Design a protein around this motif. Sequence first.
Motif, PDB file in Angstrom:
ATOM      1  N   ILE A  48      10.135  -6.305   3.317  1.00 46.93           N
ATOM      2  CA  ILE A  48       8.866  -6.942   3.666  1.00 46.93           C
ATOM      3  C   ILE A  48       8.140  -6.132   4.735  1.00 46.93           C
ATOM      4  CG2 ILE A  48       7.782  -8.953   4.713  1.00 46.93           C
ATOM      5  CD1 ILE A  48       8.652  -9.333   1.720  1.00 46.93           C
ATOM      6  N   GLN A  54       6.474  -2.998   3.281  1.00 53.77           N
ATOM      7  CA  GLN A  54       5.215  -3.305   2.607  1.00 53.77           C
ATOM      8  C   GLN A  54       4.103  -3.513   3.624  1.00 53.77           C
ATOM      9  OE1 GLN A  54       7.816  -2.755  -0.125  1.00 53.77           O
ATOM     10  NE2 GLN A  54       5.635  -2.551  -0.525  1.00 53.77           N
ATOM     11  N   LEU A  98       0.775  -1.390   3.816  1.00 55.95           N
ATOM     12  CA  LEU A  98      -0.547  -1.977   3.641  1.00 55.95           C
ATOM     13  C   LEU A  98      -1.445  -1.655   4.827  1.00 55.95           C
ATOM     14  CD1 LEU A  98       0.684  -5.370   2.121  1.00 55.95           C
ATOM     15  CD2 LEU A  98      -0.692  -3.692   0.905  1.00 55.95           C
ATOM     16  N   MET A 104      -2.794   1.791   4.530  1.00 53.19           N
ATOM     17  CA  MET A 104      -3.840   1.945   3.520  1.00 53.19           C
ATOM     18  C   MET A 104      -5.156   1.270   3.909  1.00 53.19           C
ATOM     19  SD  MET A 104      -1.611   1.177   0.127  1.00 53.19           S
ATOM     20  CE  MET A 104      -3.181   0.850  -0.676  1.00 53.19           C
ATOM     21  N   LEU A 107      -2.046   0.731  -5.878  1.00 56.41           N
ATOM     22  CA  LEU A 107      -1.164  -0.216  -5.221  1.00 56.41           C
ATOM     23  C   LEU A 107       0.196  -0.214  -5.901  1.00 56.41           C
ATOM     24  CD1 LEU A 107      -2.565  -1.632  -2.950  1.00 56.41           C
ATOM     25  CD2 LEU A 107      -2.444  -3.739  -4.186  1.00 56.41           C
ATOM     26  N   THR A 108       1.233  -0.190  -5.087  1.00 56.99           N
ATOM     27  CA  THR A 108       2.587  -0.494  -5.505  1.00 56.99           C
ATOM     28  C   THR A 108       2.699  -1.988  -5.813  1.00 56.99           C
ATOM     29  OG1 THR A 108       4.225   1.143  -4.788  1.00 56.99           O
ATOM     30  CG2 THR A 108       4.489  -1.119  -3.952  1.00 56.99           C
ATOM     31  N   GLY A 120       5.252  -3.959  -4.892  1.00 59.88           N
ATOM     32  CA  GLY A 120       5.680  -4.609  -3.666  1.00 59.88           C
ATOM     33  C   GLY A 120       4.543  -4.764  -2.676  1.00 59.88           C
ATOM     34  N   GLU A 121       3.673  -3.755  -2.587  1.00 58.20           N
ATOM     35  CA  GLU A 121       2.475  -3.879  -1.764  1.00 58.20           C
ATOM     36  C   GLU A 121       1.574  -4.998  -2.273  1.00 58.20           C
ATOM     37  OE1 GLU A 121       2.481   0.897  -0.662  1.00 58.20           O
ATOM     38  OE2 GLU A 121       1.062   0.131  -2.142  1.00 58.20           O
ATOM     39  N   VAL A 141       3.021  -8.726  -1.596  1.00 57.74           N
ATOM     40  CA  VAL A 141       2.925  -9.165  -0.207  1.00 57.74           C
ATOM     41  C   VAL A 141       1.469  -9.391   0.195  1.00 57.74           C
ATOM     42  CG1 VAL A 141       3.154  -8.413   2.196  1.00 57.74           C
ATOM     43  CG2 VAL A 141       5.107  -8.311   0.596  1.00 57.74           C
ATOM     44  N   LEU A 142       0.581  -8.451  -0.143  1.00 58.32           N
ATOM     45  CA  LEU A 142      -0.834  -8.622   0.164  1.00 58.32           C
ATOM     46  C   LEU A 142      -1.387  -9.901  -0.460  1.00 58.32           C
ATOM     47  CD1 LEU A 142      -3.216  -7.447   1.593  1.00 58.32           C
ATOM     48  CD2 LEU A 142      -3.770  -6.089  -0.450  1.00 58.32           C
ATOM     49  N   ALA A 196       6.901 -13.386  -2.588  1.00 58.07           N
ATOM     50  CA  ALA A 196       6.625 -12.072  -3.143  1.00 58.07           C
ATOM     51  C   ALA A 196       7.816 -11.461  -3.858  1.00 58.07           C
ATOM     52  CB  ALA A 196       6.164 -11.119  -2.032  1.00 58.07           C
TER      53      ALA A 196
END
Lengths: 101, 101
Positions: free
Chosen positions: A66, A69, A73, A76, B26-27, B29-30, B33-34, B54
Motif C-alpha cells: 500500500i 502505491q 501515486l 506521478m 497507470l499500474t 495497484g496504483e 489505491v487511487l 484495493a
Amino acid sequence: AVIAFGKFKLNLGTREMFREDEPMPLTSGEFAVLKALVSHPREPLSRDKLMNLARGREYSAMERSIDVQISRLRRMVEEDPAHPRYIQTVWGLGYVFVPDG
Amino acid sequence: AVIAFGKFKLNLGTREMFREDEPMPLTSGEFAVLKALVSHPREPLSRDKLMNLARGREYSAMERSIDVQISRLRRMVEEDPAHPRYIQTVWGLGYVFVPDG
C-alpha cells in the motif's frame, strides 16, 4: 509457556499439542491461530486481527505494498511529493484524498 | 464516473487517467489505491482499509482462511464443535479463547 485447557496442553514455544498427553498433529495455520487466541484469553479477536497476528508475513507485505502505491501515486501526481496536495496523510488515521473543493 | 483534480482526470469505470488530457500509464495497484482514496474524499483510509478495498481478492482469501483454521481447531478440540467451549464466537467482535477459569 504452556497453556492447558480441558484435556489439552499447548506449548507456545515448541508448538507441541497434547490430548491427555498424546500428541496431536497440528498444522502451522492451526497453530498460529490457536496461539493468537490463547495468548489473548477472553479477548475476542476479529479476523483482521487474527490475520495480523497469525499471517503476519503476508499481512505486513500487503501493508508495505500500500505504501509503495501511495509513494508512486505522489511521484506521478504531485508537484511536490514531499508536500502532497491531493494524496495526503493524517498520522494515526490513514491516507486521504483532498479534493480541489 | 470521472473525478477531476488539478490537471488530472480519472475515469473510475475504464481506469483511464489523464494529465491535462494526455494519458498516464497507470499500474493496476496504483489505480486500485487511487480509486479507493478518491471514492472516499476527505475520509482518511488506513492501510488495512486500503488493503480491504484495493486488494479485496487476497484480503478476503486471508479472511476465509482464518475461518477454516477456526473450524479445524473446533473439530480437533471441542466435544461439540457446534457448541464449542474453548474456541468461541462473539458476533460482531471476533473469535475468543475461553479458559477453564
